[PDB]
Symmetry: C2
Amino acid sequence: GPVPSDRELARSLPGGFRSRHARVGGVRLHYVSGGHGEPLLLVPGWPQTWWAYRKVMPQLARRYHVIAVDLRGMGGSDKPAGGYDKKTMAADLHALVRGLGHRQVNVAGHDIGSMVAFAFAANHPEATRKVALLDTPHPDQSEYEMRILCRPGTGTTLWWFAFNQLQALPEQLMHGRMRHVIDWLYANSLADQSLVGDLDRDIYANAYNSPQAVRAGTRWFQACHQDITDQAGYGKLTMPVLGIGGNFTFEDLRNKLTAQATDVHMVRASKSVHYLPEEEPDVVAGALLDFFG
Amino acid sequence: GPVPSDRELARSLPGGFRSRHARVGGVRLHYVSGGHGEPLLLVPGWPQTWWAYRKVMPQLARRYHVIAVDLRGMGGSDKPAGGYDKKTMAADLHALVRGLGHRQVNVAGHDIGSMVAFAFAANHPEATRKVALLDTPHPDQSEYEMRILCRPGTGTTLWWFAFNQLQALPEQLMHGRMRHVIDWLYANSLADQSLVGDLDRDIYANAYNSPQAVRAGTRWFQACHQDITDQAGYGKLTMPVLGIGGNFTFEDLRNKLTAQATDVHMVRASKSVHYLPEEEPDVVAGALLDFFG
Ligand SMILES: C[C@]12O[C@H]1[C@H](O)c1c(cc(O)c3c1C(=O)c1cccc(O)c1-3)C2=O
Ligand SMILES: C[C@]12O[C@H]1[C@H](O)c1c(cc(O)c3c1C(=O)c1cccc(O)c1-3)C2=O
Ligand code: NA
């Protein structure tokens, strides 16, 4: 059944967060901001919303003016026909913080949002103070080397990477049924399932359960070829970079970031598989606070 | 019912085919047979049934006694807990044809059914007159080499190999919704969509639409590591082998069969992507008549 609105959710957090909207380049974005200090943009990924950062936002709000956004195609934000490449979505966020009167910001992103975080630093270095990448590197040529099958007992099948490439079938299969997808993902990541409760899962499922919302989600993934091409155009990132890697992705994240960025710092979230802000918020909040300063 | 019975479907075919059953080793298998002459076992794959051979069965029934089967886990056949490795499924079919009093049969299989067809020749050579593999080679180490992502225009996303590895999520997402799966597959293979009509698609969807049927289907794919292990133990087939390959699987199929078999013939289905019996039925019917003699 129904879940609380974004205003209800934002207000439920300590730190005085408010749910807001802003229109950038004709597209309306939802974000939740609060706290005081230098600006900190938080970007979530699939299939989640700004609410993915709930466990860390209050602590961060003590030091930063936190801006937690729904990406284009996500949650309360508009779901236009296109522009789901990370370069365009990063430009969205850039227009946003600039519209808010910020010349440069701290940026952290998770999952799809980490890609957007990287694209932001890549395309808008002057507006980028520091950037933190949570678990997920930007697409590059290595995306084409991902294997369909893992040998038994090794790693997790990244099935949704192939599946979300598809036209039509995803919304056809997943509409109304996104809670099952969320349950599968959490079942193959959380050390304790109670790390993300029923309500939290239902908030994501409700945001993604319509065919248009599923579809918008897939566009982030279908954009991968374009993202890969754009990535070839990026010079190395030279501002401070933070990579926070889960227990099984850490060394691959370190490799990619050290190759694509010149001032890289790494942190290992040893008790996490992927949903870092939810699996080890203590590590993410602490890492970001020490890193952004 | 939702669609015509297998009994109705069998009778609708010229050549006087009849739908039957038989129990082998506690597992009840459905098949449709007809015609006169030397026995010819026909094996379909995912997500199809014996009905996939409808366009060629009448032509073949004039020269061979055709036996078109639903595999274990498929269509009208039982769907037990296990035994979905291709070796076990081949033993099923061996027991079946021996129970019918045939010492040797010709064998042809497509898709998953082609793997079983190969396993049949491999494990029961004395019961194999000749064997034809339609498009799909038996699993080997190369399966761990399949790529999650294709460069644009470089081929189709083979997403279902990854997806069908999963526990629970496949039934949850696909039950009641297999028609959409079938449509996607046909949308990415048929040169003309009317090659497979609306009712035919619903016949397949109906066979697979319950959670148990989706699940049984995934077992064929989850057995892949075990199939790969079994393949390593096989000697070269020395009976006549025919490979019929689609325009894009041909050369891989030719490589594998020639390495695994000493008497190999190849045929190119130049206007087909994968569903050879439905896409180029005359080429298929014609090739089998020439090969089985
Ligand atoms: C872009 C994205 O594909 C999205 C997904 O959010 C993602 C990604 C990586 C994972 O390793 C990963 C996941 C994910 O949902 C997940 C669940 C369980 C285990 C696991 O390891 C993962 C990604 O970077
Ligand atoms: C075992 C199986 O995975 C099953 C599927 O039936 C299959 C297989 C190979 C394909 O290349 C292939 C398909 C398939 O449905 C399909 C549709 C569109 C393009 C295309 O190329 C394919 C297989 O071998
Ligand atoms: Na509010």
